[PDB]
Design a binder for this molecule. Structure first.
Ligand SMILES: Nc1ncnc2c1ncn2[C@@H]1O[C@H](COP(=O)(O)OP(=O)(O)O)[C@@H](O)[C@H]1O
Ligand SMILES: [Fe+3]
Ligand SMILES: [Fe+3]
Length: 896
DNA sequence: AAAAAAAAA
């Protein structure tokens, strides 16, 4: 029966016109084909065509054929009747009131029409193709279950008339795609990644511009003549669409390490070691774990190893995962220069992928595009990982393995990339489970991985590589099977072949250790300090300790476990200084603009471009664990509250950071690089402040103390002594005298891994014949990090009236509306820059309408969710809101 | 009581 064009697919935005369901259907199939040929990484084409066991060309047309059937579920009454249309020729199929999504209908119709063109009736390939297509709106569904010998009728397709028109369309796209035969195999994971492509296809050809243009040249009628024509047209128009979006590949020439970094005279031990023994190893899918100190060129080493594996795997894409928005920003710059130098583009964007990317001027847009420039299309919402190259927060990749809508899109996203995750030592137990499940899915999808780290506990390292190997190899780990990683070297690198699972430790090919920057050992000195009312009266020990610095000069940092304590020290220091030397305070609770300003002048004093510029003073910094995030600091003395060793040794890396540059003059009192470790005095298991034991688990603080004491003042040889300690704090059980504290720590840790497992998509082998796990969830949006999270507040000022102001000075009004009534992005940036990150608590509950944003604001993404904290000013008082009193000190940051 | 991230077709 010749097909009827009265059935539609798109109505909206077309101004009283309709686009025919076939014209969409063909477009989507046209789109997938081009995507298959010009977007998909070559290696990935291979991976997919492998799974179906057929040539790429055949696999190409299959997928295209499948893309054509995506919106077939629209050819029902429930859907068609949404707008005016004449169905007088189509009696039957009267509304059931199920109100079933067209996508759901596609998955329900396909398993029973498909075999009419050779697919195995009740067969897995058919089962998967239908399920996968039925999920083209970011939600899979269960396989159709039925109790009769006429499932088609059982599922509501009961009319000869209607059933004839679905079949017409089944055959129209079959034909236009040149009748491809059914593949013999198809696995869950492959199918998911294909679903992503199919989704990119539909989206691409759904843009209002592209539609309007096809509305001009609609087909005259439903002939194979007319439909063959329509397809082949859209076919030509699609590679355009790729450019507008910036989805064109960024392929990059092979190169040795020095061809790739010509500005580098003397590559270091790590880079030489990697560049030398790696290419021979890198012969396809694998993972590589570099674990090395800071100031060793891990970055260029990464790009290099990435560059090898990329070529080995037919995968020119890149995702770099960073721990923070900031470091993702910085790296996004570096990787872009790297791109410019390295490639001979301008239709390929190097995306930046985190939640504050819009509010960055130099990324976002405000034909002749600048190379690697962002594109409107890629600027949201679930699209980022579709950028050919991208760097972002690690949180962006972890979303792929969380059970949420459209995760198949992001899985597709990554499947052609070479993924690189920096700072793995940074990932807590909850996150580490998401990472393991991602690794497992990247493993099975033939995507190579580079992991970079500073010291890593062997257990984590093992767990991560095991995860990647599990994914690579099809089956999970035996109880009997030996562990893949029993020891880690710092410095060290390690390679893992997917194909045979062989692991090559760096030491295996070279008995010498990898040369790092030589450096003096670190004096670590434990110091008792009197408790006063369950707190730390540091008043004295600061005297004793800071005195040389006040006389002869230098630079030193005090790191306190909480922000409260952080502020009190700066106060206590301040009084003292009434009676050069400078004083600074850093932590989370500062307005953005202010934090970005402090940090800039803090690194400029204590960092490196200060020392080279001789701007480095003759000075104290107080901070919390912001110091553990990347800050170019070099202090002479460091004093920290006891924290876990890994975090102490982390912290301590700021001691004499740049001694290896000749250009530095340590004051005479500074005999050796030193970290002073404050711990309270006691009176049979070590006690610590409640304040401390709520941020770090109690036992671990014990185990660190216990372990530090055991050394008797001994310095820490760096890096010979480090990894040892990191391993040991968790491994040597004799280090925990409090079995109740050590057991809770374990329970708390089990609790974090547990929530995670609840939160992540299936193992690939659990998903082999069934994709529904990927999107299934019951009883809100799943998190990539454990905890009650954080909210952004913004302080406003009330005079004796009270009128709303944005400064204590009450000259800049509180903008109730914004510069066309609505807010420009630049308005938002102004507002957001004022804001402060504040951890969720009980206070969140007890809010009022005067803590909620005005009504204009609600219409702005970045603004709707701000909480407002009033500040009472008279001719600025602490102000109750939530249940406590908030004062935003300008020198000390937010207080409560 | 740290720090950290986090509308589509
Ligand atoms: N031989 C080298 N290998 C790698 N980086 C080098 C080398 N010589 C100089 N550099 C530069 O010195 C800086 C060292 O920083 P890097 O070690 O990558 O990170 P961090 O300094 O944060 O540990 C980088 O800018 C790198 O570009
Ligand atoms: Fe649809
Ligand atoms: Fe569609």
């Amino acid at each position: 029966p010749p097909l009827d064009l009265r059935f539609w697919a798109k109505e909206r935005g077309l101004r009283g016109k309709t686009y025919p369901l076939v014209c969409h259907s063909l477009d989507a199939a046209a789109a997938a084909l081009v995507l298959w040929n010009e977007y998909l990484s070559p290696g990935l084409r291979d991976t997919i065509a492998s799974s179906m066991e057929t040539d790429e060309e055949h696999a190409g047309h299959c997928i295209a054929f499948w893309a054509g059937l995506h919106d077939i579920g629209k050819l029902t009454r429930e859907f068609q009747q949404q707008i005016a249309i004449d169905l007088s020729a189509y009696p039957g199929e009267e509304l059931s009131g199920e109100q079933r999504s067209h996508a759901a209908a596609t998955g329900k119709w396909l398993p029973f029409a498909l075999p009419s063109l050779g697919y195995p009736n009740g067969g897995l390939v058919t089962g998967l193709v239908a399920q996968m297509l039925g999920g083209h709106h970011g939600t899979f569904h269960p396989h159709p279950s039925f109790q009769s010998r006429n499932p088609l009728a059982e599922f509501g397709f009961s009319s000869p008339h209607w059933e004839k028109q679905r079949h017409a369309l089944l055959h129209a796209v079959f034909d236009a795609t040149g009748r491809p035969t059914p593949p013999d195999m198809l696995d869950g994971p492959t199918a998911s990644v294909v679903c992503g492509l199919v989704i990119l296809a539909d989206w691409l050809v759904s843009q209002e511009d592209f539609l309007l243009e096809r509305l001009t040249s609609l087909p005259a009628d439903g002939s194979a003549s007319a439909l063959r024509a329509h397809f082949e047209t859209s076919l030509r128009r699609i590679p355009s669409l790729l450019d507008a979006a910036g989805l064109r590949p960024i392929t990059v020439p092979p190169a040795t390490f020095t061809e790739s970094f010509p500005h580098l005279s003397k590559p270091n031990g790590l880079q030489a070691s990697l560049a030398k023994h790696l290419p021979c190893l890198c012969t396809g899918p694998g993972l590589v774990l570099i674990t090395a100190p800071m100031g060793e060129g891990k970055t260029e080493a990464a790009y290099h190893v990435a560059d090898l594996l990329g070529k080995a795997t037919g995968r020119p894409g890149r995702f770099l995962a960073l721990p923070t928005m900031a470091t993702a920003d910085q790296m996004h710059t570096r990787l872009k220069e790297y791109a410019r130098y390295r490639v001979e583009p301008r239709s390929s964007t190097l995306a930046l992928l985190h939640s504050m990317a819009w509010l960055n001027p130099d990324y976002a847009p405000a034909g002749h595009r600048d190379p690697f420039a962002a594109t409107d299309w890629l600027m949201g919402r679930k699209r980022g990982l579709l950028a050919p190259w991208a760097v972002g927060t690690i949180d962006q990749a972890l979303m792929a393995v969380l059970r949420a809508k459209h995760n198949a899109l992001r899985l597709f996203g990554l499947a052609g990339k070479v993924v690189v995750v920096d700072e793995a030592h940074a990932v807590d137990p909850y996150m580490q489970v998401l990472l393991e499940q991602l690794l497992r899915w990247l493993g099975t999808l033939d995507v190579p991985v580079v992991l970079l780290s500073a010291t890593l506990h062997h257990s984590i390292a093992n767990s991560l590589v095991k995860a990647y190997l599990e994914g690579a190899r099809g089956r999970r780990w035996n109880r009997s099977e030996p562990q893949p990683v029993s020891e880690v070297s710092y410095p060290g690198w390690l390679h893992v072949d997917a194909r045979i699972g062989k692991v090559t430790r760096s030491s295996d090919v070279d008995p010498l250790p990898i040369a790092t920057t030589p450096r003096k050992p670190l004096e670590v000195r434990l110091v008792d300090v009197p408790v006063k009312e369950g707190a730390l009266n540091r008043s004295t020990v600061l005297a004793k300790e800071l005195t040389p610095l006040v006389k002869q000069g230098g630079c030193a940092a005090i790191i306190c476990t909480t922000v409260a304590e952080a502020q009190g020290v700066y106060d206590l220091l301040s009084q003292w200084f009434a009676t050069a030397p400078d004083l600074y305070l850093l932590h989370s609770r500062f307005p953005n603009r202010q934090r970005t300003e402090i940090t800039a002048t803090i690194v400029d004093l204590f960092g490196k471009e200060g020392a080279q510029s001789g701007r480095r003073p003759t000075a104290v910094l107080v901070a919390t664990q912001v110091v553990e995030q990347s800050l170019d600091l070099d202090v002479d003395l460091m004093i920290s509250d006891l924290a876990p060793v890994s975090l102490l040794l982390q912290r301590a890396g700021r001691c004499w950071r740049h001694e290896h540059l000749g250009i530095i003059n340590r004051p005479q009192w500074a005999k050796q690089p030193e970290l002073v470790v404050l711990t309270p005095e006691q009176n049979r298991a070590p006690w610590f402040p409640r304040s401390w034991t709520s941020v770090y688990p109690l036992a671990l603080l014990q185990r660190t103390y216990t372990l530090l004491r055991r050394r008797n003042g001994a310095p820490v040889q760096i890096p010979e002594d480090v990894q040892q300690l990191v391993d040991d704090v968790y491994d040597d059980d004799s280090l925990a005298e409090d079995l109740e504290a050590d057991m809770e720590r374990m329970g708390e840790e089990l609790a974090q891994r547990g929530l995670a497992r609840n939160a992540v998509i299936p193992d690939p082998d659990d998903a082999e014949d069934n994709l529904n796990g990927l999107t299934e969830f019951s009883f809100h949006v799943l998190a990539t990090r454990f905890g009650a999270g954080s909210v952004r507040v913004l302080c406003y000022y009330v005079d004796t009236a009270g009128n709303r102001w944005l400064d204590p000075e009450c000259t800049v009004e509180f903008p109730e509306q914004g510069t066309e009534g609505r807010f420009t992005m630049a308005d938002c940036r102004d507002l957001v820059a004022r804001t402060i990150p504040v951890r969720m608590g009980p206070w969140a509950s007890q809010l009022t309408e005067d803590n909620h944003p005005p009504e204009a604001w609600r219409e702005s993404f970045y603004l709707r969710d701000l909480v407002l904290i009033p500040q009472r000013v008279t001719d600025v008082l602490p102000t109750e809101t939530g249940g406590r009193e908030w004062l935003l000190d300008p020198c000390k940051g937010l207080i409560f």
